[PDB]
Each structure stands twice: as structure tokens, then as C-alpha cells.
């Protein structure tokens, strides 16, 4: 679970405890553990007796979470709680790196999240794919408090403006059956109100200034996209690289998963850009 | 198992920049040592929990095939653990891989000190400090 | 790209460096102007746990270590840790084994059941086949 | 025999945000009118025969049969007047 | 490997000298 | 799933695609198929290999749908998503 | 109800006040990630 901006004590008090109360008493449960970090993410691991069906364990735990789901805060509730059967230890790590340093942190991290993660997650026997040190790919509007205050706006005003100007609406169809006499044609109607690009988001109107000029979103905030523009932190040897972690599902064969991931990565490397290379130096399966 | 598990624990409140500087030192020490094939570093990733923490790090030291070296894993681990003990910025460590892959984070024992009496986080912290001292005093045991 | 992604709003990094940045945030009052929030909030330093770990529904702290096999064995180390637990840890707090250490403690005296039963089964089979009570004794006496 | 067909007529109604702002009609008012008159609007529930059934609000059939009817839907501007929405939506025909 | 090799080496040396002695002793005790 | 007033294109984009994203990857799966009509109703069928237990697969697919609950629009959310094991062919028809 | 009505307050007025003065707020940390330079410290903020 994720609670953005919440300190570890609040997460454990308000999120971990309600979840643990619902999760206890699950059949064949050995022990459970919860770790809440300052990053706003709570991880709860439930360990079952050996021989327990991993599929039955997941659905039972996921159903307990859905019950406690109403007790959780709205911010935690909005993002959702993910329950997955998953080995708590790394099975294989795939590294993406530029041999001559052609690309920066943003390019490789975005490539892994957009064009590597989804392909790997589709493989059988995969429990979870994690890009270490990389955030999620999303809109990120970096407000400037001084600029917003100068324009005569507050943080709530800015947020509400983009909530109402990016909405989805359905518009029915023409010539419906409630007509007194039968119609000849039926045409669907498409009403669109969503936004897709940074320039579209930068064009969101906040207010009309005293001079008649329309205050757009880009006037006060640094609009950005991607999974995070901060410098690369994961390393291979001593160079900079993007580490992709693969956790096997319980009961899945480790040998087959390592082969499947390596086979898929070979296929993906065919359409790799120039000076882009991949390797998997860390693989306990090869010892097996 | 042709690899070792290492980590670091910087003083509380340290930024990720300080942790990364020490982690890059451990990766240099590891690759310098003979018998080490590679070094995979994850600054900000806790070794014992795999959760993000600013003042912790994780390094995986790959080892060459058994015929390519005259040192066993325990000798390499002891050599690295002695060298990384010279880093004064933060506490460093290195452990052997767990006997059963997929069960445990490393070799040795593993326990949790539960606080069932509501004594608070301060009392729980004191017990950890007391327990680590006693374990260090016992001969034949390393620092937990 | 045919997908769906979230939208987040937050102040930029440079405007969240020091405590003075917090006090300089501006909020609209009833009359319609903007005033800093520093005049209505109090900021002070406090210490707390990070990360917060809960094991089996209670606050807990993990502990991982290893011992020299030539000086102390895994079974000996676990027993030595239990006696330290009842000696140092105050009332209301205790240790709990996890990962392989949980399996090591959970398993019973598995050598103490199968070894005598297998010897008894072998003795009975020999007596049945060879029609004697003392002849099988000549065979099973070499097992010790 | 195939049930696939890609020549089904459809109507695309694009809302001109800048034109709507100049006209003085809020997007929430503009989108809500389309969502209710043309598309079915779910209001709340009501009880009959010991069971719970929905309550639906939508425009009648005769006033929902042509493009002119869509352009003749009226919204409330910032000055409180009734204005047809045909001056802020670019109604167009498409196929899919 | 060291467990079974040491055990079988000891068993072979002990078995060749103790089993005939065990058989004779028990049979004589029964026929006493 | 139902989306009153939405055309088949958007339903295949903001409804069917998020569901297919979370549904793909179940054990013993053979093939899947999703159909989104002009009535605003989306139907997705997941077919498993013969001999698979229907009960265990039914809860799994429902769990996958719950995992993608947040991706769905609010209008779809308030009507709910129904996941049921079901034969896609008629067994018997009663005429009144 | 007599005392609430004496002050000119309704039941909705009281309920609204309590749910807007007892809320949970998250304040993140200082010296966070999007800085253009490497920070020397990172401290969490506990806004209650």
C-alpha cells in the first residue's frame, strides 16, 4: 500500500494495523510482517506453511484486505492495495546500461518502465517486476509557491482547476427507441474532454487576470513527465545502470523463469536503440 | 553460491547522496579483491528487507567459478568484511548467501525482538543495543 | 500510449530545502489576501523510528547474524541466544525466530524417533524371517 | 459469415475550451448537460415491491433524434442566462 | 561422503571380527 | 461492465484495455476475447483448457478485475463490474 | 439540541466543523528528490 507523504508511524498506525487485523486468522498462516517506510509505502508479507496452495493463499488474503479496505484512509484507498503471491527474495536481476554513456537517467528508466516491464510481467511464473530506485511513470506538476501566490491563487485552487478541466463524459446516441415512431438510423455520439499531452495540460486555464489575460497552468508550474529525472543510483560494477528485479511466484520453477526472462530479453534486444545493452550478471539459478 | 551479500547502514538522517558515496567505495573494494567477478550496487535499498531506506544500501558481489580462484567464499567474505570495516562514514557488512534459496536473506540466525508489553520504541531500541553488545561479547560470533 | 497514468501536484524541490521554506508558504485568509503560514504553525525537532517494523501484530526489531562454524554451530548459537533473551530482555518483550531459524527451532528431535523405530523394525523383520529372538541381536548389535 | 463491420456512423462532439471560456459557460455545466440530456443519467434508487430499482433521467426521444437537437441544448452561463450549446461544441460525424 | 565412507570403513573392519563373535556367543548362551 | 452512452471505441480503450491488462496471465488460460457494443456494455470472456476447475478460475479473474478497479472511470465504478463463471451458449429458452 | 439551537447552529453545522478540524495531513520530507543538487540531509515532516 502507498500513503504519499506520510511518516512511517502514521502508516503503521492507520494502515498496517487495520490490514493486520483483517489478515489474522487466515488458514495455514505461519507468521506475518509489516514494514512501513518514510517513502510512504507499506509492505506486508504473509508467510504460509509449506505445501499450502499459493493461489488459495492469495485469494484468501486479498479478500481479507478488501474487508479492511473501508477502514483505510481515502488517499490510501484511492491508489489501491495490491496483493500478489511473490517470493520475498530476488530470483534474477536484469541490467540495462549504456556502454559509452550515450543516454541519461531519464531515458533508460523510462525505457525500462514503458517497454521492458510489461513484456516481462506477461511471462509465466513471474510474481513481480520492480525497477530499483525508479518511480512510477506519471504526470508530475511541480508548483512554484511564490508564482502561485503572486498570481492570486492557492494550492487548492490549482488542484481543483485541473480536476474539473480533465473529465470524461458519455453522450449517448441519436434516434433512440423512446421515439413515438420507429427511427431509421442509430448513430452513437462521442463527447471528449480528456487531455493527453504536456502542452494540453500546460493550457489548463486557472484564472482570468485583471488585465484580461488567461492564466494557464504552465505560467506557475514546471510541468514534467516521466518516471523521475533524478540521477541514476543503481550501479553495475561501478558504472551506471538500471537494475530490473524479478521475483518468482511461489511454486514456479526457478530454472524455467530464468530461461524465459533471458529468452524474452534477447528478443527485446533486437529493437534496442544504438549503444543500448543488457546483461544479467546476478542469477542464482545458474548455480542451481 | 558464487555470490555474496553486502550492505551499509549510514547514521540516521543521512541523505541518499551520502549513502551512495560509501556504496561506491564498497563496490571498489569488492572488485579489487581477487576472486570477485562483479559488483551490483543498489544504494537506498535495504539488504535485510528489500525496502527503500535513504541511509541503507545493498551490494551483491559476484564470484568467479570455483576453479578460477584459490580462495573459498568464506575466505573472500572475511577479507572483504575486514576491508570494509575501515570505512568510518557508516557501518558496513557482508554475509554469505542463505543455504536454501528463497528462504531467508542470508546465512546465520534470524530473529525479531517483539514488544508485547507496550514499552515503546525507546525501550525496544535499548534492547537491540543490549542484545548486540552481548552477542559481540560471546566468542565465535560476529556483530549482528 | 494506450495506457493510463496518474497526475500529481507538489511544490518544486528547491522550495522545500529548509524549515524557512515551510514558514514561507502562503494561504488565503477570509479577507482575501495571502499571508505566510509561519505565523500560525510551530516547527520543532522530534525523533522517531524509520522504518517501523511490526512482526505478528506487535512492534518488533529484526536481528541477523552469523557465527564461526569452527567455534560455534548453528544449534549452539540458537541455544545461546535464547538464554540471553531471558537474561537481558525485560518483561513483556521476547524474541521470535524467522526464516530458516524458525524451521530449525520448529523441528522436533527428528533423529530421536526414526533411529530407534527403524532399528526396531529391522529387528522384528529379521526375527520373522530367521525364526529367532537372539539371531537378529547378532545383526543389530553392529549398528552402534 | 462475419459480424464485423467498420462503417458504422458515429458523432464526435468536441468541446472548444477557449471558446467556452469566452462564452462564459463552465465546462462542468457544459459536460453535465450532455451527460444528462443525451446520455442516461443515474440519479438514485427507489423501492417498489420490496425491491430496489434505479431512477434514470434522460431527454425524451423526439428531442434526441438530430444534430440540430444537440446544438439546441441550452446551458447556464456566468450571467445566469440560457444559451444554446451549439456555439461551443464542434459536432462532426465519424465512422468506426 | 565423509559420513558414509568413514562408517563403511569402520563397519567392514568391525563387522568381520565382531559378527562371528556375536553369533557364537548368543548361540552358546541359548544352548546353555 | 457497463458504460451508458460511451461508444465502443472508448470502452475498448479505458475499460476493456485496463481489464485485459490485469486479466492476462492466469494459469491454464487458452485464449480470451472482449466485445464492446454500441449499447455501452462490455463483455470479456476468458477460456481455459479443458479439465480446469471453474470455481478456482472464477475467483481469480474477479480478483484481477478488483486489482484494476481504480483505473476505471467513476461512472463505470458506480455501476459495478460483474464477474461470473458462465457458459457462452444457451442451454434452454422459456417463452412467455 | 436546545444549546445548539441557542447559538444559531444546526446539526449539519456542527458535523461539518468536526470533520474539517480533525483531518490527517501528510507533509512529506525536506530536501527531497527533485532538487537540482545533492542534499546533505533528508528529514521527514510530521504535520498533525
Automatic annotation (TrEMBL), chain B:
Compartment list: Cell inner membrane
Domain of life: Bacteria
Family to which the UniProt record says this protein belongs: Belongs to the resistance-nodulation-cell division (RND) (TC 2.A.6) family.
Protein name: Efflux pump membrane transporter
Species this protein is from: Klebsiella pneumoniae
Automatic annotation (TrEMBL), chain C:
Subcellular location: Cell inner membrane
Transmembrane portions of the chain: 111-130
Coiled-coil residues: none
Family, as annotated: Belongs to the resistance-nodulation-cell division (RND) (TC 2.A.6) family.
Protein name: Efflux pump membrane transporter
Species: Klebsiella pneumoniae
Covered residues, full protein: 769 to 912 of 1050
UniProtKB/TrEMBL annotation, chain E:
Recorded superkingdom: Bacteria
Location in or out of the cell: Cell inner membrane
Transmembrane segments: 1-24
Membership in a protein family: Belongs to the resistance-nodulation-cell division (RND) (TC 2.A.6) family.
Protein name listed in UniProt: Efflux pump membrane transporter
Organism: Klebsiella pneumoniae
Gene designation per UniProt: bepE_1
Parent-protein start and end of this portion: 1009 to 1040 of 1050
Amino acid at each position: 500500500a502507498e500513503y504519499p507523504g506520510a511518516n512511517p508511524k502514521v502508516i503503521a498506525e492507520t494502515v498496517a494495523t487495520p490490514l493486520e487485523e483483517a489478515i489474522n486468522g487466515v488458514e495455514n498462516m505461519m507468521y506475518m510482517k509489516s514494514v512501513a517506510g518514510s517513502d510512504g509505502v507499506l509492505v506486508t508479507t504473509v508467510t504460509f506453511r509449506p505445501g499450502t496452495d499459493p493461489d488459495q493463499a492469495q485469494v484468501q488474503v486479498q479478500n481479507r484486505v478488501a474487508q479492511a479496505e473501508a477502514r483505510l484512509p481515502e488517499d490510501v484507498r484511492r491508489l489501491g492495495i495490491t496483493t500478489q503471491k511473490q517470493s520475498p527474495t530476488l530470483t534474477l536481476v536484469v541490467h540495462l546500461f549504456s556502454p559509452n554513456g550515450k543516454y541519461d537517467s531519464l531515458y533508460m528508466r523510462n525505457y525500462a518502465t514503458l517497454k521492458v516491464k510489461d513484456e516481462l510481467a506477461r511471462l509465466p511464473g513471474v510474481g513481480q517486476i520492480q525497477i530499483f530506485g525508479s518511480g512510477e511513470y506519471a504526470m508530475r506538476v511541480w508548483l512554484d509557491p511564490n508564482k502561485v501566490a503572486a498570481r492570486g491563487l492557492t494550492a487548492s485552487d490549482v488542484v481543483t482547476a485541473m480536476q474539473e478541466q480533465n473529465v470524461q463524459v458519455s453522450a449517448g446516441q441519436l434516434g433512440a427507441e423512446p421515439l413515438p415512431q420507429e427511427s431509421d438510423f442509430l448513430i452513437s455520439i462521442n463527447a471528449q474532454g480528456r487531455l493527453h499531452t504536456e502542452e494540453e495540460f500546460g493550457n489548463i486555464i486557472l484564472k482570468t487576470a485583471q488585465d484580461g489575460s488567461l492564466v494557464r497552468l504552465r505560467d506557475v508550474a514546471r510541468i514534467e513527465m516521466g518516471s523521475g529525472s533524478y540521477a541514476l543510483r543503481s550501479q553495475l560494477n561501478n558504472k551506471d545502470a538500471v537494475g530490473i528485479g524479478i521475483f518468482q511466484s511461489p511454486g514456479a520453477n526457478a530454472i524455467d523463469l530464468s530461461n524465459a526472462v533471458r529468452a524474452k530479453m534477447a528478443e527485446l534486444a533486437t529493437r534496442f536503440p544504438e549503444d543500448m545493452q543488457w546483461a544479467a550478471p546476478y542469477d542464482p539459478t545458474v548455480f542451481v | 553460491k558464487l555470490y555474496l551479500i553486502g550492505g551499509v547502514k549510514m547514521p540516521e538522517g543521512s541523505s541518499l547522496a551520502r549513502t551512495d558515496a560509501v556504496i561506491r567505495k564498497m563496490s571498489e573494494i569488492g572488485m579489487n579483491t581477487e576472486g570477485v567477478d562483479y559488483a551490483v550496487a543498489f544504494p537506498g535499498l535495504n539488504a535485510l528487507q528489500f525496502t527503500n531506506t535513504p541511509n541503507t544500501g545493498t551490494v551483491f558481489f559476484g564470484l568467479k567459478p570455483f576453479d578460477q580462484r584459490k580462495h573459498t567464499a568464506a575466505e573472500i567474505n572475511a577479507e572483504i568484511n575486514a576491508k570494509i570495516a575501515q570505512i568510518q562514514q557508516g557501518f558496513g557488512f557482508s554475509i554469505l548467501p542463505p543455504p536454501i534459496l528463497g528462504l531467508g536473506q542470508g546465512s546465520g540466525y534470524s530473529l525479531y525482538i517483539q514488544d508485547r508489553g507496550g514499552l515503546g520504541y525507546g525501550a525496544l531500541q535499548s534492547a537491540v543495543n543490549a542484545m548486540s553488545g552481548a552477542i559481540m561479547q560471546t566468542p565465535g560470533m560476529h556483530f549482528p | 500510449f494506450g495506457r493510463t497514468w496518474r497526475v500529481m501536484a507538489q511544490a518544486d524541490g528547491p522550495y522545500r530545502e529548509s524549515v524557512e521554506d515551510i514558514a514561507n508558504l502562503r494561504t488565503r485568509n477570509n479577507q482575501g489576501e495571502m499571508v505566510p503560514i509561519g505565523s500560525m504553525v510551530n516547527i520543532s525537532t522530534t525523533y522517531g523510528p524509520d522504518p517501523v517494523i511490526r512482526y505478528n501484530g506487535y512492534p518488533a526489531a529484526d536481528l541477523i547474524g552469523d557465527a564461526d562454524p569452527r567455534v560455534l554451530s548453528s544449534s549452539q548459537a540458537m541455544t545461546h541466544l535464547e538464554e540471553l533473551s531471558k537474561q537481558i530482555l525485560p518483561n513483556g518483550m521476547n524474541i521470535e525466530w524467522t526464516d530458516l531459524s524458525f524451521q530449525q527451532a520448529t523441528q522436533g528431535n527428528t533423529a530421536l524417533i526414526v533411529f530407534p523405530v527403524a532399528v526396531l523394525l529391522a529387528f522384528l523383520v529379521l526375527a520373522a524371517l530367521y525364526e529367532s529372538w537372539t539371531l537378529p541381536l547378532a545383526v543389530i548389535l553392529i549398528v552402534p | 459469415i462475419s459480424t464485423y463491420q467498420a462503417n458504422v456512423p458515429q458523432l464526435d462532439v468536441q468541446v472548444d475550451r477557449d471558446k467556452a471560456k469566452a462564452q462564459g459557460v463552465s465546462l462542468t455545466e457544459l459536460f453535465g448537460t450532455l451527460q444528462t440530456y443525451l446520455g442516461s443519467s443515474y440519479v438514485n434508487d427507489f423501492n417498489q415491491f420490496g425491491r430496489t430499482w434505479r431512477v434514470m433521467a434522460q431527454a425524451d426521444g423526439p428531442y434526441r433524434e438530430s444534430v440540430e437537437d444537440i446544438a439546441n441544448l441550452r446551458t447556464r452561463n456566468n450571467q445566469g442566462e440560457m444559451v444554446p450549446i451549439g456555439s461551443m461544441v464542434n459536432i462532426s460525424t465519424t465512422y468506426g | 561422503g565423509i559420513t558414509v565412507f568413514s562408517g563403511m570403513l569402520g563397519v567392514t573392519l568391525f563387522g568381520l571380527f565382531l559378527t562371528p563373535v556375536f553369533y557364537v556367543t548368543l548361540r552358546k548362551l541359548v544352548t546353555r
